[PDB]
Design a protein around this ligand. Sequence first.
Ligand SMILES: [Cl-]
Ligand SMILES: [Cl-]
Ligand SMILES: [Cl-]
Ligand SMILES: [Cl-]
Ligand SMILES: [Cl-]
Lengths: 28, 28
Amino acid sequence: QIARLQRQIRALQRQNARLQRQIRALQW
Amino acid sequence: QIARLQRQIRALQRQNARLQRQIRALQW
Ligand SMILES: [Cl-]
Ligand SMILES: [Cl-]
Ligand SMILES: [Cl-]
Ligand SMILES: [Cl-]
Ligand SMILES: [Cl-]
C-alpha cells in the first residue's frame, strides 16, 4: 500500500502540472 | 504514514478537480 499510494501521489502531481499548463494555454 | 498519504491524495484530487472545472469552462 505504501508504494501504491506514493506512486499515486506522484501521478497526481504530474497531472496537476499538466492541468496548470492547460489553463495557462487557454487563458486569454 | 498511510493515512498521511491518503490525506495527500485526497487534497491533490480536490485540487485537480478544481483545475479540471476551470479547464471545462474555458473549452470551446
Ligand atoms: Cl510530496
Ligand atoms: Cl510534473
Ligand atoms: Cl507532459
Ligand atoms: Cl501567459
Ligand atoms: Cl500507517
